[PDB]
Structures are given as structure tokens and as C-alpha cells.
Amino acid sequence: SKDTEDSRKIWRTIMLLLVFAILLSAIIWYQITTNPDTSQIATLLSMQLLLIALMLVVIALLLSRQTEQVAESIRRDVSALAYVMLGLLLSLLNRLSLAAEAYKKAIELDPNDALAWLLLGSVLEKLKRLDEAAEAYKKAIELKPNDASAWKELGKVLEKLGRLDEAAEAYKKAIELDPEDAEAWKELGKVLEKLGRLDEAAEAYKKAIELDPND
Amino acid sequence: SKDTEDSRKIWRTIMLLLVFAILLSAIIWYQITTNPDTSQIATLLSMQLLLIALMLVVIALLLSRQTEQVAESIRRDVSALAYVMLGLLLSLLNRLSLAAEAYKKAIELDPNDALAWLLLGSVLEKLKRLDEAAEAYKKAIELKPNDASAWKELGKVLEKLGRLDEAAEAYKKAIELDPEDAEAWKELGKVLEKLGRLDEAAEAYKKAIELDPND
Amino acid sequence: SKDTEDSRKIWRTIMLLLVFAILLSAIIWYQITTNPDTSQIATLLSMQLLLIALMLVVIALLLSRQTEQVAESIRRDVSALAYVMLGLLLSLLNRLSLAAEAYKKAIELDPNDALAWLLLGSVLEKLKRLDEAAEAYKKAIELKPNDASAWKELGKVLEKLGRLDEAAEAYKKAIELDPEDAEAWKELGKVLEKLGRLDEAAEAYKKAIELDPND
Amino acid sequence: SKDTEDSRKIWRTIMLLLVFAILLSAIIWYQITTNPDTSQIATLLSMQLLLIALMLVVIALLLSRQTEQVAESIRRDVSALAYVMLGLLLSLLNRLSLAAEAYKKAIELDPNDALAWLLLGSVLEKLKRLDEAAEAYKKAIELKPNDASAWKELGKVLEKLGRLDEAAEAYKKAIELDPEDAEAWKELGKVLEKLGRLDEAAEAYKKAIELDPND
């Protein structure tokens, strides 16, 4: 919201430069009429003209700054979307290492781009960069706590890392967010079975079968 | 067309600030020559200078505003296309929940983006969000009444919702718009048969077969 | 190149508004020193101030115009690329009617976008809009006479339209541009055979086989 | 960093135009009070007004220039990403010749776009433009010396060109950068065997098998 604050400061600055020159000019109009002495009258006109000159230059400097501020903001916002989109295209051609870089660039431009973080996570898992993938998913999840897909995907990475207990918890969270996700239920089952949690595993397996009879 | 109206107001404002200063300055040129009294002459010069100072500041404020107005309009238009495109890419990777969000964002930026509405509809159906899908298709159709594809897709959602009568009507409209759409004819047939409208179902089935002998 | 011409006119205008005010101001500096009469001196100062006031307003109006001109040019260029890209994405999801509209939009924004014309052609053929497809390909070809792919694709549309003679010519042109295109050779063969041009058909068939022994 | 240098020159110019007018105006305020002679006082006011007029015009010209500089920079950066993205989409539809052109355009806009160079390389290989592909890969590699994928892809082009020795070296570099790349190891093996380097070929083949038992 800094732009709102800065905009108000810019407007106030322009106003104040003029108001000062206005008030003095109004004073001078009176003073010139009152005291008919060229050497005082002209001195006041020179001062008025000087204040105006400064005012206008400062204003031009403010226009320059605002033009740049606006333009940079747009450049950034456009680029961040372009990098996410680029990563998606690179991923479609299986240019996974390059896709990861594109997502990384979107993140640097906008660190709370949960999508870029999620997608980075996916690419890193596909590239077998499992530890880095888990961290990327963790970030996407903190940004969006109710992203059931991110939770499920985290689950898969954690299982691959041998983190069966944490994997089971991540799958369980995806399920609470969306109980019909038969895949999540089956994968939860697999983790629980592997983990020795046979009764829970059996229930998870059953839910995948029962929830959608055409799975 | 508000921008056209605002542009005209901005131009008129700049013109009027100057015209007032012009007319007065022309008056002052005469008055100075006519009445050779420094205390009156300078008073008029001070006033002229003040009007100019205000004029120029106001103009600078208008330049600032117009710069921002133009820039924001562009940012919005660019972003709305980017969100539709993003949704399409996310859909290609089967990131359907995320694709739906991207289409939603395009809609908020432009509520009459029939494409975003149609596509949202498609994603929602694929995600089994059938009631929401029907509403999204309805919006796309109101925006584009002769979108035969949107009508056919609405038909599919309505049938899935058990709305066989409404589904048959939606398929029929797609067909009137494009009579060669064998798929629409076959799907119409399926609805009509399910609906007990056996004679109409038979005709619809026949048209799908007859319209294109290599279907 | 109109922008170059307009830019020069804008610069010249700004220069001339100032140069006139400069020359007169220099004249006035001399005249004030020479003729010590307040009623003449001030009259000249008022005139100088008025010319400056006009100059600056006109300049501000020019800044406004140039800002808008630049911004609009960019908006158009960005949008035209976005529409081609959109059409390609819609085509990947088989949203062919929508893909055609996106290409059409790119064309309206830039009528010499051979790519958009070519792609439109392709979509129209896929949509069975063969007559329209032939015209779109014709436009892409006039824009790029050495686009062997566009010539081959035109060939396919023309054959589908029953225009076997014109199809054979379009295939032949694609071949002259790229003689190794075994597909073009085979398709030329098919047209020539269908057309009764059996000796030429035989040669075309042989070239497809001989050019690349692993075709 | 030229923009930083130019920005500083623009700011300094605006400052200096004003500072000169300030210093002189301050001098004039004193001189008017000191020497009560209209013909000298007004001469100084005219001069002050002239300096201001010039200053403001020059500033407006600088605003115009900066607006254009900023806008052009953005246009270029946006377009270069769009061309890479366009090439990727064209490649997905197998519009390879067109994809190559899009990558070429991105390169002209930004000659150190390693991604565009790499991708161009890939398209050229797919299009059987092997000599050109090798050069494009060489450029991508010089820009990014630790792009293991670019090294492997260069390897494939070089082998296709009959350059078995250079191909083996390119594959070896990809392997040093990423030792788990079983594909690179197998392809290295194939080159080494073809090249008569049977003992090295055997080791390379073994590594592909041993590195990932599920390859």
C-alpha cells in the first residue's frame, strides 16, 4: 500500500508548492497596489517567479518518478505471470530443468506466488530433487493452507523421502479438505500399510473403493 | 466510453485554464500601455503570473492522472488475457483446480469474458462441480447466445445433473446453430431415449449416422 | 513510419514555441534597457509571459498525446501476440472454433500477421470450413510466398474442395521450396493419380520413397 | 547500466537548469532592492523569465524522452518472453519451422537468451538442420556452460553430423555436470562403441544400467 502513501505524498507536495506560491502572490497583489515603489514591486515579482520556477521543476521531477514507478510495477506483474506460463510450457515439452528455472524466476519476482511454488515443487519431484521439492511444497502450502492438491503432492514427496509418518499426515490433510479424493485415500492407504498401520490402511483402501464405485 | 468523456474533460480543462490566462493577459497588455502606473501594471503582471502558475500545476496533475489511467487500463487488459491463457496451460497439465482459479481471475478482471466463463464451466464439470458448471455455462451463453459448443457442453452438465429435459433443450439449441454436429445429435438422442422420448431419440440417432457416413 | 514523422513534428513544435519566445525575450531585454518607460517595459514582460504560458500548455498537451500514442502502440502489439498464443492454446485443447476467433482477433489487430492467417487456415480446415480455409491460406502465402508449409496445407484444402488441379500446383510449389518434403511428394502423387496424371503421379510417389529410405 | 547513467544525466540537467535560474533570481532580488531603476529591474525580470521558459521546455522534452525510453524497454522485454513462449506453443502443434522463427525473433530481441538459443537448436535438429543446430547449441552452452541438457543435445546433433569424437566429448561434459543421467551415459556408450572405443563404451553402458536399476 506504499504506492497509496507515496501517491498522497506526491499530490500533497504539488499542492503545497502551489499553495505557498498562491498565498504569496495574493499578498503581493495587495502590496503592489498599496506601496507604489518599483524597487519593492519588482522584487516581489522576481520572488514569485522564482517560487513558480522551482515548483514547476519539482513537479516535473515528480511526473518522471511516477511514470517510472507505474511502469516498473507493470513490468514486474506482467513478467511474473509470463514466467509461470513459461514454466508450464517448458514442462509440457518435458524441459523440466528449464521449467524449474522459470518458476524460480516468477518466485523471485513475487515470493508469495503459491502457484509458482507448487509447480516448482512438482518439477523438482519429477527431477528427483525430493528434498528441495518438499520445501517448495511446504512454502506453497503455507501460502495456501487449503490447497488439497499441494498437500497430496507433498505427501508423495515425503513418502519418496522415506518420511512415511509425515507423508501420512500430509495425505490425511488433503483428504479432510476434499474427502472424495479417492487417489488421496488410496495413497494414504499405501503409506499406512507401509508404515505398519494396517487397520487404518484397510479403512483408507476401502474408502477409495467405496467413494466412487467407478474408480 | 467513460475514457472518451474524461479525455474531453481533461482537454477542455487545460484549454480553459489557458484561455482565461490569455484573455486576461491580452487585457493587461492594453491596460499597461494605457495607464502608465507601476503600482497597477505590476499588480496585473503578478495576477497573470499567478494564473499561469496554477494552470501549469493543474496541468501537471492532469498528466499524472492520465498516465495512471492509461497504464492501469493496459495492465488490466493484459492480465485478463494472461489469466485465460494460464488457465488453458494449467488445464493441459491437468491442474484443473488451479485452472479454474485462473479463469475466475480473468472473469473478475472482465465479467463479460465469455471465453473465461465457458472454460470455467468446462473445468468445473471435469472437477465434478456440476451445479457451478451449469451456472458458468449459462453465463457464457447469455454473453454469446450463438455459441453452439457452449450449448452442447451445458447439455452434458445438465444431463449429469439429472436434468434430462433441460439437457435435451440445450442440445437442440446447439443443433439448430450447427445442424452437422453429429456428436450433438447423438447426445441429444441419448438424452431423449433416457427421457422416454423414443421417437425423437430414434430420429436424433439416425441424424448422427446419416449426416456424416464416416462418423 | 508515421510515428517518426509525428515525433519530428512534436519536437519541432516544442522548439518553435520556445524559439519564438526566446527571440522576443532577447529583443525585450535590449528594449527595456534602451527605453526606460514602465508602461512599455511591463507591456513587453506581459507579452513574454503570455507566450510562455501558451508554450507550456501546448507542450503539456503534446506530452499527453505522446504518452497515449506510445501506450496504445504497445497495447496493440502485446495483444496481437497474445491472441496468436491464445489460439494455439485453444487449438491444443481442441477448442477449434474458439481458436479460430482468437486468430481472427490477431488479424484484425495486425492484417499482415501471416502466422495468424496460416493458423486460421488450419483451424478452418479442421472445422471443415474449406472455402474459408483456402482463402486464409492464400492470404498467408501472399504475405510469405516462400512458406512451403502454407503451400502444402493449401494443397490439402484445395484437394478436399475437389480442386485437384490447383491442389497439384500448390503441392508442387511447396516441393520446389523444399524438395525433401516426402509428405508433399506423396500428397502430390495422390492428387496427380486422382487427377489422371499417372506418369507424373508415379514419379512423385517414387520421390517420396527414394528421398528418405526411412519414410 | 546505460539507463542508470542516462537517468543521472537527466536529473542533473533538470537540477542545473533550475539552479542557474535560482542563483540568478536570488541575485536579482538583491539588485532590484538596491538599484531602484525600472529599466534595469525589468531587464533582469525578463532574463529570469526567459531562463525559466527554456528550463521548462527542456524539462518537458526530457519527460518525453524518458517516457519513450521506459516504454520501449518494457515493450522489448515483454516481446522477447512472448516469442519464446510462442515458439514453445508452435513446437507443441509441431509447427517446427514457425517455432524456429519465433525463437529467432526472441534472440534478435535478446542475443543472450540462452533458452531461445537452446530451443532453436532443438527445433533445428528436429527439422534436420543439423549444422545450424550445432551452432545454436554451441551458443546456448557458451551463455550457460553448466547446462547439462544443452551439452547432451549438442552431443546428439554432433553424432548425427558424423562428429563422433566431438559428440563423445559433449556427452562426457553433460555427465560430469550430472553423473546420474543414465540417458547421457547410454548415448555416450553408443558413440564410443561406434567410434571403436570399446572399453570406454562398455563402462558407459554399465553405468547406465547400474546408476538406476529401474532404467
mmCIF file of C-alpha atoms in Angstrom, chain C residues 3 25 27 44 56 74 85-86 128-129 131 156 179 191 204 215:
data_model
loop_
_atom_site.group_PDB
_atom_site.id
_atom_site.type_symbol
_atom_site.label_atom_id
_atom_site.label_comp_id
_atom_site.label_asym_id
_atom_site.label_seq_id
_atom_site.Cartn_x
_atom_site.Cartn_y
_atom_site.Cartn_z
ATOM 1 C CA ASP C 3 5.377 7.807 -35.674
ATOM 2 C CA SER C 25 12.676 37.879 -24.904
ATOM 3 C CA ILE C 27 14.625 41.714 -28.070
ATOM 4 C CA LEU C 44 6.677 43.531 -23.166
ATOM 5 C CA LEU C 56 3.976 25.361 -21.772
ATOM 6 C CA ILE C 74 2.333 -1.195 -27.074
ATOM 7 C CA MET C 85 -0.752 -17.587 -28.478
ATOM 8 C CA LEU C 86 -4.333 -17.924 -27.202
ATOM 9 C CA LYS C 128 -14.399 -28.329 -42.332
ATOM 10 C CA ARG C 129 -14.702 -24.626 -43.341
ATOM 11 C CA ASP C 131 -13.603 -22.471 -48.672
ATOM 12 C CA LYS C 156 -4.703 -30.254 -48.857
ATOM 13 C CA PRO C 179 12.453 -30.777 -52.338
ATOM 14 C CA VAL C 191 -3.520 -35.667 -56.369
ATOM 15 C CA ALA C 204 6.004 -38.195 -57.266
ATOM 16 C CA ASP C 215 9.958 -42.863 -44.570
#
